[PDB]
């Protein structure tokens, strides 16, 4: 069943939806700024009314609705990368010439 | 973040409507309750410090009905927290009434 | 009393050990009524008022 | 500290000749009853450290 | 996952702040505000405050 | 005699007369200011006529 799902393909012919790879290291949430601001004044909220609306939809959602949202983005981004690849002639010969 | 109604099928249908379009917070709801109660109680000559204590860093003031489970007794969802009879309200508030 | 005042230090909460209520003159009350309010003042500090 | 590597001092303890011993001279009784304080199960005007 | 090649990591780096803010008076607010949940005179409420 | 005093009621229908709860931690009377003022004879009696 894995071979029928193309587990044998070349791992270089498998292109990310963006034509790029990535290694992101961005400093993130620790929670000391949120807890410090609570002790100073407990009468505020960090969650805005637009974030409470977005939070509500994730309560009221199923995998089917989320799958089509993201499998539609993957199509949209891959068509924008196909345009960029065609525009700039990105092929193994072109990338190797740059290297 | 809970659509609490006595009609169980209604709360399931209200999830997919513009009901979730407008939102508010318990913190903001409490801050309006303490601000109005403080001004009104002063106008009745009480001078309670439920608003002074809310503005101290070691004191916290919350609404009373928060410790209950709201997912349980949903048939009393739309019943207000007014506690005293419409005539014992007139007894205290100099003839004024809020409902009838 | 002087044994009590010797150990009357400040705690780690930036807090004194006890609450001091220094009596110079006594309000005019019967002695038995004065003893009864001392019982109350010893119990006002306890959790749930003793 | 004694010689801990190759029967000789480390990079950090070598050449420390020292000075005259420190004398902790409390100007108040606080340092005296904090050192002998037993913070296990008692209030004793200290932290609750299990 | 044979061809993924993308990684993401998050760093919990904390910095110092408040050049003058009197640490010992915040530690009083923290252990008094949270006294209704966590034991106020403990070495953890003093350490996290 | 306790069922007759509505000890059977849903405890979620009992409302405080303010509709709010409260957690008070207030810096309180210690008595060091008053005892200091007595020794200096500055303000020996702090109780006013009212």
TrEMBL record, chain B:
The chain holds residues 745 to 844 of 1240 of the full protein. This is Coat protein.
From TrEMBL, chain C:
This is Coat protein. The chain holds residues 249 to 298 of 1240 of the full protein. It comes from Rosellinia necatrix megabirnavirus 1 (isolate -/Japan/W779/2001).
From TrEMBL, chain E:
It comes from the Viruses. This is Coat protein. It comes from Rosellinia necatrix megabirnavirus 1 (isolate -/Japan/W779/2001) (RnMBV1). The chain holds residues 101 to 149 of 1240 of the full protein.
